[PDB]
Amino acid sequence: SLRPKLSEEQQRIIAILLDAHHKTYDPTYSDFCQFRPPVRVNDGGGSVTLELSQLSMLPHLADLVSYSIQKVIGFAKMIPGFRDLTSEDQIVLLKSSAIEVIMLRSNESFTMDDMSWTCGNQDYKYRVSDVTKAGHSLELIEPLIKFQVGLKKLNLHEEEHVLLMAICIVSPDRPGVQDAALIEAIQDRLSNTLQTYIRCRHPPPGSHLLYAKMIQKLADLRSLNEEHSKQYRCLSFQPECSMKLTPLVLEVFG
Ligand SMILES: C=C1/C(=C\C=C2/CCC[C@@]3(C)[C@H]2CC[C@@H]3[C@]2(C)C[C@@H](CC(C)(C)O)CO2)C[C@@H](O)C[C@@H]1O
Numbered sequence: 001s002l003r004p005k006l007s008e009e010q011q012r013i014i015a016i017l018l019d020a021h022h023k024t025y026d027p028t029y030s031d032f033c034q035f036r037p038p039v040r041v042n043d044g045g046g047s048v049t050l051e052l053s054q055l056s057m058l059p060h061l062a063d064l065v066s067y068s069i070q071k072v073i074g075f076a077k078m079i080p081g082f083r084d085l086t087s088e089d090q091i092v093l094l095k096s097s098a099i100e101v102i103m104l105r106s107n108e109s110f111t112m113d114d115m116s117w118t119c120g121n122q123d124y125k126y127r128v129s130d131v132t133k134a135g136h137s138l139e140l141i142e143p144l145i146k147f148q149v150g151l152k153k154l155n156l157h158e159e160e161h162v163l164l165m166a167i168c169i170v171s172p173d174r175p176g177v178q179d180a181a182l183i184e185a186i187q188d189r190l191s192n193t194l195q196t197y198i199r200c201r202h203p204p205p206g207s208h209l210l211y212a213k214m215i216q217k218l219a220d221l222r223s224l225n226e227e228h229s230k231q232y233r234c235l236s237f238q239p240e241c242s243m244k245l246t247p248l249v250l251e252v253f254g
Contacts, residue, residue: 003199014193027108032120038123040129055238058245065102075101089178107161170183
């Protein structure tokens with residue numbers, strides 16, 4: 001019913017987050033050619049044995065995820081209030097949300113045209129088959145694609161997109177956080193900004209219960225996070241796997 005206007009502070013928060021995202025997310029994916037090259041072994045049969053023996057796409061995807069974690073760290077540091085947190089809590093939040101923010105931000109390259117993450121020519125077009133070539137199974141891939149399509153269909157404004165990533169990172173219910181109260185205060189400031197923005201800037205019918213749908217996606221991410229963690233564990237058992245990853249990836253998921 002009531003549609004209060006965005007306060008000057010809330011307008012500032014949105015501007016800061018849009019700027020932060022524009023500085024940390026290259027929509028041309030021009031740095032991707034710097035990663036170890038993607039390699040696609042012939043695996044039409046989806047052989048787990050072959051996939052683990054080769055892990056052909058792991059070096060490239062590990063580099064992409066590692067690169068993305070660095071960008072997420074940069075984005076997070078610009079979130080209003082994040083700097084008010086202790087270094088210890090900042091690191092806990094970054095490590096726990098990293099994979100979730102990667103899944104969220106990747107929605108920008110994801111396309112329902114062919115259900116792929118298109119970041120350039122054929123070489124930089126990622127499909128579910130590339131994820132299997134990196135050692136992951138359908139238990140993660142299936143819900144991941146469903147998540148991407150569900151998020152796509154929300155038709156989020158960039159303002160809503162960056163606020164969702166910020167809310168995801170600044171979550172007081174992450175294991176190991178010390179000052180949950182401060183984190184919750186910061187998240188509430190971001191959540192109220194999002195709710196206010198939706199109610200006065202998002203036209204119908206796409207605004208109908210949009211906030212609730214966005215919050216549900218954060219729950220979905222928790223599930224994907226746990227599943228990715230389980231599979232990363234299996235992946236780590238493969239001899240020589242560490243060399244195909246990166247020090248940052250090893251720390252965040254190890
Ligand atoms: C990263 C990003 C992009 C795409 C994301 C993808 C396409 C390739 C496979 C990934 C990156 C998937 C998200 C999760 C999925 C994943 C399930 C995670 C990886 C898991 C490892 C590291 C092997 O354990 C393998 O595949 C491209 C761009 O929009 C920036 C964004 O920042």
